[PDB]
Motif scaffolding. Structure first.
Motif, mmCIF file in Angstrom:
data_model
loop_
_atom_site.group_PDB
_atom_site.id
_atom_site.type_symbol
_atom_site.label_atom_id
_atom_site.label_comp_id
_atom_site.label_asym_id
_atom_site.label_seq_id
_atom_site.Cartn_x
_atom_site.Cartn_y
_atom_site.Cartn_z
ATOM 1 N N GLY A 234 3.208 -6.170 -3.810
ATOM 2 C CA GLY A 234 2.895 -4.789 -4.142
ATOM 3 C C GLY A 234 1.382 -4.638 -4.198
ATOM 4 N N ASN A 235 0.883 -3.800 -5.100
ATOM 5 C CA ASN A 235 -0.564 -3.620 -5.211
ATOM 6 C C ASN A 235 -1.189 -4.964 -5.605
ATOM 7 N N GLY B 122 -8.211 -4.367 5.305
ATOM 8 C CA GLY B 122 -7.451 -3.165 5.033
ATOM 9 C C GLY B 122 -7.422 -2.873 3.549
ATOM 10 N N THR B 123 -6.964 -1.685 3.188
ATOM 11 C CA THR B 123 -6.905 -1.302 1.789
ATOM 12 C C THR B 123 -5.515 -0.730 1.465
ATOM 13 N N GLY B 124 -5.131 -0.766 0.188
ATOM 14 C CA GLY B 124 -3.835 -0.240 -0.225
ATOM 15 C C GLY B 124 -2.620 -0.826 0.488
ATOM 16 N N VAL B 125 -1.671 0.035 0.862
ATOM 17 C CA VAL B 125 -0.468 -0.431 1.553
ATOM 18 C C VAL B 125 -0.798 -1.056 2.899
ATOM 19 N N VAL C 81 1.654 -5.923 2.444
ATOM 20 C CA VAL C 81 2.161 -5.103 1.360
ATOM 21 C C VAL C 81 3.441 -4.370 1.739
ATOM 22 N N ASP C 82 4.394 -4.362 0.818
ATOM 23 C CA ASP C 82 5.645 -3.647 1.039
ATOM 24 C C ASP C 82 5.503 -2.278 0.369
ATOM 25 N N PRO C 83 5.434 -1.198 1.165
ATOM 26 C CA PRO C 83 5.297 0.149 0.600
ATOM 27 C C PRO C 83 6.336 0.502 -0.450
ATOM 28 N N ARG C 84 7.538 -0.055 -0.327
ATOM 29 C CA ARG C 84 8.585 0.238 -1.292
ATOM 30 C C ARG C 84 8.149 -0.142 -2.700
ATOM 31 N N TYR C 85 7.285 -1.149 -2.812
ATOM 32 C CA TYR C 85 6.842 -1.606 -4.128
ATOM 33 C C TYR C 85 5.373 -1.410 -4.456
#
Lengths: 335, 335
Positions: free
Chosen positions: B197-198, B256-259, B285-289
């Protein structure tokens, strides 16, 4: 109208059977594992379930439980046996206690896992059982107590030996749902690889909707009889992957053998697989689960066809398409 | 010698506390959630647990339960409350029933999840609780009943408010073990990507061994007192990943940043990461989480240090090294 009681009413099979019966105008009562009624209880309490049967006075009872030793992973062995084995005896004994032998017909959901070892292929009603897990031994008891109440008391009681059957409601622990869920997520760029075991493994996959129909048919006869419920057609795990991928416009190429086997993306058609491009490796084998095991489960539903006229109406491709579409919808809510 | 009873004896904390106490020459009795004795029971049966305390006559009782609402996922809410909340009352009531107020000292394992909302940072003994899950409400009751028996009966009873603590025994559902397990499997070519996640999320991670020691210390005092048990030092999920990867000779680059953030393999040193090469993308990163949530759990263990002299002795890097080594060993049995 007719009244039915379904145990395990919220699982894949129970939910579909409840729909099937409501559509036919039944008043449907259920317990977990409009004219629909939910009751508290799990088959571990004789008093509670007898009370429920006494209030319901069902014409039909469908004793569905858990369908796989894997779906029962988090329960204690004693609890599983108490509900899947003893629960069956309690239901049959309550029907007798209440004097319902003449009104209530009983259906028990067995499983192909009763074959354990295997030996002869395909497996039919006469093929001997050899349970390989505590769960399957509990199911063996449920199968035999049902046969015994039929033979000893002349009760209308019978067993459905079910082979694998899927649908969009299939639990995520089964390999079919694992594959459709993964392919959709990969196509939508939410995941990158799908790891499986031996992709040569051959399976007999049917659709839950066709199977709950046979279950109902098994209680409309003049005499109770046991039946193997399957398609009798084989497909490889690898074919299932190809089919699922094809639903999203992904054509696959397989390079390598055994634990080295890999699925490469050849081409992509349409706009549902944005997260995949030619050259991508999206299917691979996990050595931890790879195993070249012979002797294979494949059911022979000939008797069902001969005596009842039952045959699966939904095809494997329509099943895969339906499962893929449902997982694709969930997936795009997140891309 | 001294005698102790440990509830939840087979979990991460129980296993380490049992070792710690045996080493000190204690006779150790336990129940699940040489001089070591296992008893049947789960704290739901007053008669059984009172009988056990009566036979054991413990000098010390350690009421460890589940440490996270996630570790309790497969239980019914009622069962969790019955054992984690009511079980605590039963233990305290049994100590009184048996006239052991003067001999038995009681320790209860609370959790930082009691802070729920948060607000003030860092969190200390005076920081107010605000439970956010049924599990945490059950723990709130356990915390307060323990304070109440202390204040009302002058019993030696106290609470340890535990923040995250890991080890090679940590459950695979926690993010730290997920990361070490994944990094090892990837390095050994058994998997290809780790989805988190984040990665900016800041955590307070200590070692279970240091924490079970503080638990024991909390019962060696002249008067009972409650304490926050934490390190008070923050590290990002991303730093944890880097550290774990560094244990296997993998240096990471984040682009990259975030998701959109991804972990790229810059270089590989040594022979424990054969399945990884420069350029490889192994963390994503998994956007779902993914979630940019503020207000952060960070404990202030000042009181523990001031009154008892307790301080974590094992460092975060040694903890990661130990976890990675254990997962690497399991992994190579399969490459």
């Amino acid at each position: 109208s007719k009244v039915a009681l379904i145990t395990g009413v919220t699982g894949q099979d129970g939910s579909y059977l409840a729909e099937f019966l409501l559509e036919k105008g039944y008043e449907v009562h259920g317990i977990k594992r409009p004219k629909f009624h939910l009751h508290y209880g799990d088959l571990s309490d004789t008093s509670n379930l007898t009370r429920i049967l006494r209030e319901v006075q069902p014409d039909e009872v469908y004793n569905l439980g858990a369908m796989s030793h894997v779906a029962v992973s988090f329960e204690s062995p004693e609890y599983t046996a108490d509900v899947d084995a003893m629960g069956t005896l309690r239901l049959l004994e309550a029907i007798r206690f209440l004097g319902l032998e003449k009104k209530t017909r009983f259906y028990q959901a067995s499983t192909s896992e009763l074959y354990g070892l295997v030996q002869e292929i395909p497996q039919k009603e006469t093929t001997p059982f050899y349970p390989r897990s505590p769960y399957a031994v509990a199911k063996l008891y449920a199968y035999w107590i049902t046969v015994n109440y039929r033979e000893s008391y002349g009760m209308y009681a019978c067993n459905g030996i079910l082979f694998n059957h899927e649908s969009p409601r299939r639990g995520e622990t089964f390999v079919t749902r694992k594959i459709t869920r993964a392919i959709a997520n990969i196509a939508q760029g939410l995941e990158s690889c799908l790891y499986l075991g031996n992709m040569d493994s051959l399976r007999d996959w049917g659709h839950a909707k066709d199977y709950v129909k046979m279950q109902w048919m098994m209680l409309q006869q003049e005499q109770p009889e046991d039946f193997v419920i399957a398609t009798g057609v084989q497909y490889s795990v690898r074919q299932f992957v190809e089919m699922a991928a094809a639903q999203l416009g992904i054509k696959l190429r397989f390079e390598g053998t055994g634990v080295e086997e890999k699925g490469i993306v050849v081409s992509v058609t349409g706009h549902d697989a944005p997260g995949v491009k030619p050259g991508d490796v999206i299917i691979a084998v996990d050595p931890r689960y790879f195993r070249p095991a012979e002797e294979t489960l494949l059911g022979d539903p000939t008797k069902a066809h001969e005596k009842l006229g039952w045959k699966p109406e939904i095809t494997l491709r329509e099943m895969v398409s339906e499962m893929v579409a449902n997982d694709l919808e969930a997936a795009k809510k997140h891309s």
